[PDB]
Design a protein around this ligand. Structure first.
Ligand code: K79
Ligand code: CL
Ligand code: MG
Ligand code: ZN
Length: 313
C-alpha cells in the first residue's frame, strides 16, 4: 500500500495545470495515469497489479493511427484529472473512479474514421450500432477488457456500486459522440439560464458529466499554441485519410476532409472554435467556475488562428 508513483519536479507541478502536455516518452504515460488515479481517488481504490494489467491491455487495444491513439487516451484522462482536482467536493468517490477510466477507454480500437464513414462504407459495426457507432464499440471493448482474467479493477465494489460505475462509464463514453454534444449543451445552457440546474437530479449530473467528457475530448484546443498547432496536423492527417476513402466510395468529401482544400483549414478551425469549442468551455465554466482556464486557453488559440488567416503567421 505504501508505493506512490512520483514524477520529476517539472511534471509534478505542471501535471496539476489544465494545459499540461504528457510529453513524447510513451513509457512514462502509464505512470502519469496511475499518479493521477492515486491523487484523484486514493492509493486504495484500485489494486496496483490489476490496474497496471488493465492499463497495458487498454494501451494494446489503441491502434497506430495519427490522432485517435494511446496518447489521445492519456491526454483526455489528464484533462478529466485537472477538472476533478479543481472541483474536489462536487464528485462522488465512484464518479472519480469511473470518469478517469472512462476517458482512458473512450476511443478504444478507433480506426481513425468517423461514424459517417462507417455508415457509407457499410461497416458491420454500423449494422450492430445504428447511432453513436464507434462509441458503443468503445464501451463494448472497455467491458471486454474488464472481463479478462486479473483485469477487473472494480471487483472490490459491491454489486450495486459495480452497476453504477459501469453505468457512469457507458454514459461518459457515449457522450463523446460529438453529434450528441450540441443538444446536451443547449439543454444545459437553458437549465443554467432558467436556474433549474440541480446536481442532485441524476439526469442533470449525467448531462454535466457528458459536457465534461466533450471538454476533455476536445482539450487539444486548450493547450499552449505550439501543442495545439502540432496536434491539428495529426487531427487533419486522419480527416484527409477519411476524405481519400470517401473519394474511393465515389463520394466528394466535405472540405474539412479534402486534402485538396488544405488552404481552407485556418477558416475551418475558426468555425470549429466558434461552433463547438468556445460554446463547450463557456457552458462548462458557467457550471464549474474553476474550469475557466480551459475557456481562457481556448480563446487564446482562437486568436492565434485569426492571426494565421490575417497572414501574420
Ligand atoms: O480541430 C478540429 C476541427 C474539426 N473537428 C471536427 C470533428 C468532428 C466533426 C466536426 O464537425 C462539427 F463540429 F460541425 F460537428 C468537426 N474537430 C476538431 C477537433 C479539435 C479537437 N478535437 N477535435 C476532434 C478531432 C477529431 C474528432 F473525431 C472529433 C473531434 F472533436
Ligand atoms: Cl489532492
Ligand atoms: Mg471518440
Ligand atoms: Zn477522443
Amino acid at each position: 500500500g505504501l508505493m506512490q508513483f512520483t514524477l520529476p519536479v517539472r511534471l509534478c507541478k505542471e501535471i496539476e495545470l489544465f494545459h499540461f502536455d504528457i510529453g513524447p516518452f510513451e513509457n512514462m504515460w502509464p505512470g502519469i495515469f496511475v499518479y493521477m488515479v492515486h491523487r484523484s481517488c486514493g492509493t486504495s481504490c484500485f489494486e496496483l497489479e490489476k490496474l497496471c494489467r488493465f492499463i497495458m491491455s487498454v494501451k494494446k487495444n489503441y491502434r497506430r493511427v495519427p490522432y485517435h491513439n494511446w496518447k489521445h487516451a492519456v491526454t483526455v484522462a489528464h484533462c478529466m484529472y485537472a477538472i476533478l482536482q479543481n472541483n474536489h467536493t462536487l464528485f462522488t468517490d465512484l464518479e472519480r473512479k469511473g470518469l478517469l477510466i472512462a476517458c482512458l477507454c473512450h476511443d478504444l480500437d478507433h480506426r481513425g474514421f468517423s461514424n459517417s464513414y462507417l455508415q457509407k462504407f457499410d461497416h458491420p459495426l454500423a449494422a450492430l450500432y445504428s447511432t453513436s457507432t464507434m462509441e458503443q464499440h468503445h464501451f463494448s471493448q472497455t467491458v471486454s477488457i474488464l472481463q479478462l482474467e486479473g483485469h477487473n479493477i472494480f471487483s472490490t465494489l459491491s454489486s450495486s456500486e459495480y452497476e453504477q460505475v459501469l453505468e457512469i462509464i457507458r454514459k461518459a463514453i457515449i457522450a463523446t459522440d460529438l453529434a450528441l454534444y450540441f443538444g446536451n449543451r443547449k439543454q444545459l445552457e437553458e437549465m443554467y439560464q432558467t436556474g433549474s440546474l440541480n446536481l442532485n437530479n441524476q439526469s442533470h449530473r449525467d448531462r454535466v458529466i457528458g459536457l465534461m467528457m466533450t471538454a476533455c475530448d476536445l482539450c487539444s484546443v486548450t493547450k499552449l499554441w505550439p501543442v495545439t498547432k502540432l496536434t491539428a496536423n495529426d487531427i487533419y492527417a486522419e480527416f484527409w485519410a477519411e476524405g481519400d476513402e470517401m473519394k474511393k466510395l465515389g463520394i466528394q468529401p466535405i472540405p474539412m476532409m479534402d486534402r485538396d482544400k488544405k488552404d481552407e483549414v485556418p477558416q475551418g478551425q475558426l468555425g470549429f472554435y466558434n461552433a463547438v469549442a468556445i460554446p463547450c468551455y463557456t457552458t462548462l465554466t458557467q457550471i464549474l467556475p474553476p474550469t475557466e482556464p480551459l475557456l481562457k486557453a481556448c480563446r487564446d488559440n482562437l486568436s492565434q488562428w485569426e492571426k494565421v488567416i490575417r497572414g501574420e503567421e
